[PDB]
Nucleic acid binder design. Structure first.
Ligand SMILES: [Mg+2]
Lengths: 1340, 50, 71, 69, 34, 251
DNA sequence: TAAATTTGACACTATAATGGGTTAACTCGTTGTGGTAG
DNA sequence: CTACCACAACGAGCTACCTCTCCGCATAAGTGTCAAATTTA
RNA sequence: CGGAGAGGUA
């Protein structure tokens, strides 16, 4: 155990010994973008691949080319926090070394005339933060992966679309990574057709002819030949015996002297076997057998010179007689059957009206571009560019692999374009599927869907920008001057930057981050969206793709998805699920060998998983040897069954590998229903962080991993001893073994204090380590917003009794006591940012001043001389934040105030009130004021003071950084010199800074001494340079929007407490709303006198089938009872041995628990600290599907001196009577969701109106009115409610005269209406008249 | 499916039975929204006709 | 004929391209600005500032004139 | 059917507000139809009292003033 | 042919393409006629 | 119309009209210029395409897209459709004097009472409070009443209690499937931010207390008040209209 | 209003340049053509 | 001559509410007289 | 004060 968990050890009830640790939860995004950025010259990934795929480029002649050399990313101008503050993209400049070589035309190959190379600047690609996040325009964005259909070939069939026949129609499809599509399909008459790019249909032999194939070659490729021989006016065939299966003998199958078949007998398999055992080859036939057969090859007479019969025509008696009298003794015919060898190619050729290649090109031309006069070269160019061009067709080597796998080839590589053999093979496979050999492919099968991450998408968009700039540069280079034109002067950086910025700012996948707690960020980055560019839509999906497929086992969680219209399109990646090199999803498996489950782990894809036999994770083992039982439950080929102990091939690595991160944090998931588990997993990521984070008593053990890997805490990079602890920063001194002889060995962790998050929540970093503590690497030093000693703490654990109470818990409603609101357990902090912009109007600039007219000193008590509220002043609704004032305009000026304008001064009545105020209901202090200005205008006294404070803080903290690091360096120098020699008093009798000139003979230790001195000099130099750079950066003016003078941003900090209307929920989907805050004296109290804090409703248990909450309640009571015993012992101050005994006894209580913790190793101080940390209750880890059982929880209840049933006797606090039945009581972990009544409630009497329809606006932010929809109109109609309907249609809505008359009359007390014609009706009349159709209100 | 889910919600389910029940849970959840939309359309048409 | 055809096309694009009609001289200046910006963006590796464009643009034009020239 | 009966209603405004507005409006324009405003939806659209419940009598009164004069 | 098409650009190019190009001297006689 | 950033946000109809007028003017120019026949034929064809795109974009052929690569909204699209004039501005309208809030359970009420919060009640009855304040003589002008209710004296609260007495309000929850989705209740002033419903009416509303929300409307005229009192009161519609059975049942 | 001046409009560039970019390609019922075969 | 089928095209898809971000994107050659509407005293 | 895109609640 490390020292960060010795403080508080969570008891684990799991029994399966985990072999594989939980991997880094943010591996997919980081790995993808690392591949995109990093230079891989062999495995071309990202920028290098696109650069090689576009460069080099020729001219239309070929006398000038641009050769790629290398590329490099510049250092970003601003930091992450700087970009967030300034609202600019955190990007890195891309500089590429490009070489232009010029060729002579006089020489055959004059390659050496002039070479010009330099660093061209193109584009500013955004960079990824250490937590997988992008910073665009100040906001923080996340790019989610996409599960899209793989490139390759997919055979499918429609399950009886044509209801008249009921036949099964098969269709093939060739999906490339980029290019045109291709669809082979059938018809009810069994003919095969081609659809190009889902256009109209043609007979598919058109493609064959376009590939330069004639009819004889087509028949040779598809149909195999039967040989008919005419000799002396009689007919024989060459017969291969394995052909008369399932057919009826039309003639007598005879031999030279043997009789086999009679009339009206089917050739059964035993007769065929007799045929192979008699060894006959030549079989005589009558003449009517040929009638019905089709000739394979054309036949032309050598004498007359014309074709009697070409390929593919039905032979008859007259035709065979003519051919026999012609003199062709050998006839090749196609072999046809009705069950295995069907005549489809011949039928398609018959329906085909095209003779040879050029007619096929004309026909495909008339398909692709109808209405245009065809030409030979145009058709040839279009057909060669549709499929056989390297720029308009590509499978990207992953479509090639699936393509060769689905056609049962061997190599997994090849060309990126289609070819003749590929088309022949795919259509042959389609024919075979039609015949009966083979099976169609599944669409939802996880072997056909690929994960496209951020790196691939960014590479594709960058390649689009590259082809745009490439087409431009190729056009410009071919005609302009060639000698004095630098390579950087043609390339415009605009298209590439536009492409990357569009992708990173306005895509369907680069979305706003949900970061109200670390769990939300983690479950947002591990997200797979089936929609997006090249994906499905909410209309393009039915029940087939939304539903769970058996191949999702271990790759995709089945119980984490939005429950609205995105029920199956937004999936969550599993825990151990990695990604393949091609993008497929693979899972770990423990490899078993002849019965022993070895620790070797293999990663298996979806197609390989169905081959072997996989054992379940809940199978018991003997000393990590063989299985216990003989018949183990296993799964194979998508179905589960029983198998022997020697037939297995793999075992599940752990029982947690099926569920995702979010669903694995819910204790007792195995008892909950699927629906309520889904709801709990969905609501766990909306929990607002509270004021003081508190650990859950019943955990799972995954809290630590989620907290550490979320990148929200402050993990220690290198272990050591903490040197200086503060509320703002941590100074740590590294150990000797983990420290480079170059550096000082001092690390500084800065802590973020009260920064606004995306969802207006506060983000704070509270240090958890105290002064003088040895901490190793991987230890948490500062807890984030929802972390407690490195464990995710989303909510608070509270006392709960399950009992109905006077109707206040009626339908999921929750009654809460006053202890919860007094102790501010659910009091949150909301930091809200308000912005005021000083626009440059058309009559003068907007000034910010304290001289606001028509306002007294009562509203200006918070404003300073510059008109900005002081930091720290508490502000209420309607108060003035900044005193921005704007001119009105000559139109808004009245003649009365125009006279005094030129007499009493211009600054008299020219301006009006346009100050920033507080939205109603908002309160709280001011914590931060940022004043951004335009470069060129003097700001005010306030902004000068702001920048003075900024420079002072920067210089102070950066100087303190230097001082601490140099103190550590001098300490290292002292340690090194005393490791060399013996000098103790002479160092401390001399100034600390003068510890460098002392020395002796030169050796290695003197060498790192000199290296340390050099690092000191470089340290102070970098100090000075970064100080100067920071000063210049802060003294310069920001680049604002055009027409903007200055922007004032004010941060308010509201403190929100709970009130009737605030939603709460547990972790088992038992959501509810607060109904009443109850005084503590009325609460039902137990025998001891402790009142229950919250009273829930029991009826939500049976109907929703979430028993995990009851078991969690009992487990929480047991844990809190043990913790109460510990607290009582500590308060009595008994001993150190007794506490050690009791804690050890409580730890080793499970039956076959995985962990083994022993208290003899721990010292007395560790025991005391542990007991102090457990005095509030012992945390318990309950893994999903492998958690504690009823016997264990009852043993815990017995140890803690609680009734085993979990139910205690309550007394009514209001009256003192005893409740007739025992009531289940225990501690449950409740959250506080982000649906607050403050943000939900809204009211409006009369406000602003729209322009076109002139009815009141809609929205709380813009003070709108509620819509009275069509359904409610029908309801009032059904009542017969005429007058209310009329008043809601005319006078409370878009009728200008009626509503102002209504206001005037109600102000006068008379309650009467005067309706009028609504404006929307006249809008409709004018629109329909503009349609050109005369409509009018016909009087009478 | 041939083999049924033998265990109840008190004894706790294993991995595969829970995985099986997810199918019905998701199908019902989607059918709820689909039938809601269809009922809304039918109600609109019926209100119009009469 | 090429001169006349190009002149007619560019004059047509200078009167009917946008919702709001801008005079031909202003459109020429807008380009006299677009090219300069691109030239300077290529030369320096970053987008120009208004003062740099004032320095490089013209003898009678200053920061305010071209600031007004930006829409 | 319900859709066809609703579209074939004698009032073109109700049909236009229901479905297939283009076709219904074209048919009404070519036929030179006219609306008598007898349905509840028509008066909801135009902005008068519905001929049902409390307002019904008023409409009847209006009718008995339009017919008798 | 004059059939299933709706793009004005396609039709315009179709009628435009029925007229052949002029040589170095064809323009001379055309200008002489003018 | 201009926006807050100085930029304008015009309608697509301006673009369509610009197209049509430009092509018509150029046709007139060519006609007076004696252009060849193919030229005037092309100009006439594009004029026809401008016109029909104006009438309805995606009807004849390819829809004319604007700058953001989306088809433009024609007059026919502003007439018909789910978001057209008929189904979004003539049948259903946005209404003044309307509020919205989350609901909790009130067990001490009757069938004809609803617990309205004080702030929503003050905002809804603002013209009524102005009128009664003016009648009583505590305010001289409408502006004085505005500022007085804006700083919420106790006399304002007393007059608000006087105004709401025997003044029913309509509670409404969407989707209103059947006619019982809207009902008239007498208001009772409560401190808080949630409308308190009666437990028995939750079956008619199909309303659960898990965060559900509903809207409040205020009848203004006398006919509307009697309309809500005699026809819409929760004590009148006891039996369901679908079948003759009571709907207010213990649950 | 007389006069200034930056805007606004229109007319004119004389080597030879000769056919354009492109997007994405459920389910269901009703209506109208377009043959089809005997 | 006209009873019949298979394609193409068109119109349809609950309700209400809340939050956030985006919308003159890669492309373009300058001079020269004449009128004229906004600008100083 | 508009329109699109993304997400969330009932
Ligand atoms: Mg609800």
């Amino acid at each position: 155990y490390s020292y960060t968990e010795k403080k508080r050890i969570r008891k684990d009830f799991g029994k399966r010994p985990q072999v594989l640790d939980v991997p880094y939860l943010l591996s997919i995004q980081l790995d993808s973008f690392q591949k995109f950025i990093e230079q891989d010259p062999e495995g071309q990934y990202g920028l290098e691949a696109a650069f090689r795929s576009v460069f080099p480029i020729q001219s239309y002649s070929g006398n000038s080319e641009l050769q790629y050399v290398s590329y490099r990313l510049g250092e970003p101008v601003f930091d992450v926090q700087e970009c967030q503050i300034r609202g600019v993209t955190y990007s890195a400049p891309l500089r590429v070394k490009l070489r232009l070589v010029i060729y002579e035309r006089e020489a055959p190959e004059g390659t050496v005339k002039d070479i010009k190379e330099q660093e061209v600047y193109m584009g500013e690609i955004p960079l990824m933060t250490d937590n997988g996040t992008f910073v665009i325009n100040g906001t923080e964005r996340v790019i989610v992966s996409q599960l899209h259909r793989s490139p390759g070939v997919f055979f499918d069939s429609d399950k009886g679309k044509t209801h008249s026949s009921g036949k099964v129609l098969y269709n093939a499809r060739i999906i490339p990574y980029r290019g045109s599509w291709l669809d082979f399909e059938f018809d009810p008459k069994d003919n095969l057709f081609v659809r190009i790019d889902r256009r109209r249909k043609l007979p598919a032999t058109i493609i064959l002819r376009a590939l330069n194939y004639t009819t004889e070659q087509i028949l040779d490729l598809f149909f195999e030949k039967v040989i008919f021989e005419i000799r002396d006016n009689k007919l024989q065939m060459e017969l291969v015996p394995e052909r008369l299966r399932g057919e009826t003998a039309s003639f007598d199958i005879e031999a030279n002297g043997k009789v086999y078949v009679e009339k009206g007998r089917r050739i059964t398999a035993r007769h065929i076997r007799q045929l192979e055992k008699d060894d006959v080859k030549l079989i005589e036939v009558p003449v009517e057998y040929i009638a019905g057969k089709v000739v394979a090859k054309d036949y032309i007479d050598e004498s007359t010179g014309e074709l009697i019969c070409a390929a593919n025509m039905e032979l008859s008696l007259d035709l065979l007689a003519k051919l026999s009298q012609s003199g062709h003794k050998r006839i090749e015919t196609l072999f046809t059957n009705d069950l295995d060898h069907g005549p489809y190619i011949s039928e398609t050729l018959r329906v085909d009206p095209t003779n040879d290649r050029l007619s096929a090109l004309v026909e495909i031309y008339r398909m692709m571009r109808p209405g245009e006069p065809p030409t030979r070269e145009a058709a040839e160019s279009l057909f060669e560019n549709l499929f056989f061009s390297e720029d308009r067709y590509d499978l990207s080597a992953v479509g090639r692999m699936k393509f060769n796998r689905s056609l049962l080839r061997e190599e997994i590589e090849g060309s990126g374009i289609l070819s003749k053999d590929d088309i022949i093979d795919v259509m042959k496979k389609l024919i075979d599927i039609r015949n009966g050999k083979g099976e169609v492919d599944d669409i939802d099968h996880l072997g056909n869907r690929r994960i496209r991450s951020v790196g691939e998408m960014a590479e594709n968009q960058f390649r689009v920008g590259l082809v745009r700039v490439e087409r431009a540069v190729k056009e410009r280079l071919s005609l302009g001057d060639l000698d004095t034109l630098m390579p950087q002067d043609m390339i415009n950086a605009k298209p590439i930057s536009a492409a990357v910025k569009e992708f990173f700012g306005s895509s369907q996948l680069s979305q706003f981050m949900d970061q109200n707690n670390p769990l939300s960020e983690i479950t947002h980055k591990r997200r797979i969206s089936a929609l997006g560019p090249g994906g499905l839509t909410r209309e393009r999906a039915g029940f087939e793709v939304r539903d769970v497929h058996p191949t999702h086992y271990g790759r995709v969680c089945p119980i984490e998805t939005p429950e609205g219209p995105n029920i199956g399109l937004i999936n969550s990646l599993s825990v151990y699920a990695q990604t393949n090199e091609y993008g497929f999803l693979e899972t770990p498996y423990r490899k078993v060998t002849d019965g022993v489950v070895t620790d070797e782990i293999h990663y298996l894809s979806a197609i390989e998983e169905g081959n072997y036999v996989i054992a379940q994770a809940n199978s018991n083992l003997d000393e990590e040897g063989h299985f216990v039982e003989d018949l183990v439950t296993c799964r194979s080929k998508g179905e589960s069954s029983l198998f022997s102990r020697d037939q297995v091939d793999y075992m599940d690595v752990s029982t947690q590998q099926v569920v995702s991160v979010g669903a694995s944090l819910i204790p007792f998931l195995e008892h909950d229903d699927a629906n309520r588990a889904l709801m709990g997993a969905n609501m766990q990521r909306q929990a607002v962080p509270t004021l003081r984070a508190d650990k859950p008593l019943v955990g799972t053990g995954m809290e630590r991993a989620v907290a550490v890997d979320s990148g929200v805490t402050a993990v220690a990079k290198r272990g050591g001893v903490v040197q200086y602890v503060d509320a703002s920063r941590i100074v740590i001194k590294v150990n000797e073994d983990e420290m480079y002889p170059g550096e000082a060995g001092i690390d500084i962790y800065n802590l973020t204090k009260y920064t606004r998050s995306n969802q207006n929540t506060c983000i704070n970093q509270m240090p958890c380590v105290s002064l003088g503590e040895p901490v190793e690497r991987g230890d948490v030093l500062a807890d984030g917003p929802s972390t407690d000693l490195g464990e995710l703490a989303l909510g608070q654990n509270m006392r709960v009794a399950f009992m109905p109470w006077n109707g206040y818990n009626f339908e999921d409603s929750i009654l809460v006591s006053e202890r919860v609101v007094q102790e501010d357990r659910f009091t949150t902090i909301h930091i809200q940012e308000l912005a005021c912009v000083s626009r440059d109007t058309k009559l003068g600039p907007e000034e910010i001043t304290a001289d606001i007219p028509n306002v007294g000193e009562a509203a200006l008590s918070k404003l300073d001389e510059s008109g900005i509220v002081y930091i720290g002043a508490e502000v209420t609704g309607g108060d003035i934040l900044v005193g921005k004032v704007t001119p009105k305009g000559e139109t808004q000026l009245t003649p009365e105030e125009k006279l005094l304008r030129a007499i009493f001064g211009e600054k008299a009545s020219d301006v009006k009130d346009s100050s920033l105020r507080v939205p109603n209901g908002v309160s709280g202090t001011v914590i931060d004021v940022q004043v951004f200005t335009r470069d060129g205008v003097e700001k005010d006294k306030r902004a000068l003071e702001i920048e003075e404070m900024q420079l002072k803080q920067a210089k102070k903290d950066l100087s303190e950084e230097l001082q601490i690091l140099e103190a550590g360096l001098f300490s290292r120098i002292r340690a090194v010199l005393v490791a060399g020699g013996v000098e103790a008093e002479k160092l401390d009798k001399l100034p600390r800074d003068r510890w460098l000139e002392l020395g002796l003979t030169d050796e290695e230790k003197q060498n790192q001494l000199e290296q340390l001195a050099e690092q000191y000099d470089e340290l102070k130099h970098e100090f000075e340079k970064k100080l100067e750079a920071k000063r210049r950066k802060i003294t310069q003016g920001d680049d604002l929007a055009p027409g903007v003078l200055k922007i004032v941003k004010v941060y308010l900090a509201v403190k929100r407490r709970i009130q009737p209307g605030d939603k709460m929920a547990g972790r088992h989907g038992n959501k509810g709303v607060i109904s009443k805050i109850n005084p503590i004296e009325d609460m039902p109290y137990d025998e001891n006198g402790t009142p229950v804090d919250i009273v829930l409703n029991p009826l939500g248990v049976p109907s929703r089938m979430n028993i995990g909450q009851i078991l969690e309640t009992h487990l929480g009571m047991a844990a809190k009872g043990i913790g109460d015993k510990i607290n009582a012992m500590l308060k009595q101050q008994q001993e150190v041995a007794k506490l050690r005994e009791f804690i050890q006894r409580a730890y080793d209580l499970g039956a076959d628990v995985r962990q083994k913790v022993d208290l003899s190793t721990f010292s007395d101080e560790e025991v005391m600290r542990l007991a102090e940390n457990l005095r509030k209750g012992m945390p318990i880890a309950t893994p999903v599907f492998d958690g504690a059982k009823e016997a264990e929880i009852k043993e815990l209840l017995k140890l803690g001196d609680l009734p085993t049933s979990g139910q205690i006797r309550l007394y009514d606090g209001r009256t003192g009577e005893q409740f007739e039945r025992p009531v289940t009581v225990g501690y449950m972990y409740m959250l506080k969701l982000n649906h607050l009544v403050d943000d939900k409630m809204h009211a409006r009497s009369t406000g602003s109106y729209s322009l076109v329809t002139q009815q009141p606006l809609g929205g709380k932010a813009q003070f709108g009115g509620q819509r009275f929809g069509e359904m409610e109109v029908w309801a009032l109609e059904a009542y017969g409610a005429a007058y209310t309907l009329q008043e809601m249609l005319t006078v409370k809505s878009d009728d200008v005269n009626g509503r102002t008359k209504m206001y005037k009359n109600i102000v006068d007390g008379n309650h009467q209406m005067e309706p009028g014609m609504p404006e929307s009706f006249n809008v409709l009349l004018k629109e329909i008249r503009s349609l050109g159709i005369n409509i009018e209100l016909e009087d009478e | 499916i041939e083999t049924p889910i033998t265990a109840n919600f008190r004894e706790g389910l294993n991995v595969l039975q829970y995985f099986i029940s997810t199918h019905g849970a998701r199908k019902g959840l989607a059918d709820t929204a689909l039938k809601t939309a269809n009922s809304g359309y039918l109600t609109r048409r019926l209100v119009d006709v009469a | 004929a090429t001169w006349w055809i190009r002149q007619a096309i560019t004059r047509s694009i200078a009167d009917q391209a946008r919702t709001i009609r801008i005079p031909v001289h202003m459109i020429e200046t807008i380009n006299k600005l677009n090219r300069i910006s691109r030239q300077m963006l290529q030369e320096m590796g970053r987008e120009p500032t208004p003062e740099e464009l004032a320095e490089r643009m013209l003898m009678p034009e200053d920061k305010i004139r071209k600031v007004l020239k930006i829409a | 059917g319900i859709t066809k009966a609703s579209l074939a209603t004698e009032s073109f405004i109700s049909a236009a507000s229901f479905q297939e507005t283009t076709r219904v409006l074209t048919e009404a324009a070519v036929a030179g139809k006219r609306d008598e405003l007898r349905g509840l939806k028509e008066n909801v659209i135009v902005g008068r009292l519905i001929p049902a419940g409390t307002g019904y009598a008023y409409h009847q009164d209006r009718m008995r003033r339009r017919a008798a004069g | 042919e004059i059939g299933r098409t709706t793009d004005p650009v396609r039709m315009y190019m179709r009628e435009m393409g029925t007229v052949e190009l002029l040589t170095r001297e064809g323009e001379i006689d055309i200008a002489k006629r003018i | 119309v201009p926006l807050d950033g100085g930029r304008f946000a015009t309608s697509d109809l301006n673009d369509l009209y610009r197209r049509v007028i430009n092509r018509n003017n150029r046709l007139k120019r060519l006609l007076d210029l004696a252009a060849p026949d193919i030229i005037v034929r092309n100009e006439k064809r594009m004029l026809q395409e401008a016109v029909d795109a104006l009438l309805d974009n995606g009807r004849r052929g390819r829809a004319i897209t604007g700058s953001n690569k989306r088809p433009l909204k024609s007059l026919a699209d502003m007439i018909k459709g789910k978001q057209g004039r008929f189904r979004q501005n003539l049948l259903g309208k946005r209404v003044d004097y309307s509020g919205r809030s989350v609901i909790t359970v009130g067990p001490y009420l009757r069938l004809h009472q609803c617990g309205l919060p004080k702030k929503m009640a003050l905002e809804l009855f603002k013209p009524f409070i102005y009128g009664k304040l003016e009648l009583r003589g505590l305010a001289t002008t409408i502006k004085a009443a505005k500022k007085m209710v804006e700083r919420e004296e106790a006399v304002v609260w007393d007059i608000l209690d006087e105004v709401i007495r025997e003044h029913p309000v309509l509670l409404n929850r969407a989707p209103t499937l059947h006619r019982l989705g809207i009902q008239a209740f007498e208001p009772v002033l409560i401190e808080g931010k949630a409308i308190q419903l009666h437990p028995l009416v939750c079956a008619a509303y199909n309303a659960d207390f898990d965060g559900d929300q509903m809207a409040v409307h205020v009848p203004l005229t006398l006919e509307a008040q009697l309309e809500a009192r005699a026809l819409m009161m929760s004590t009148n519609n006891i039996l369901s209209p679908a079948n003759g059975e009571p709907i207010i049942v213990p649950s």
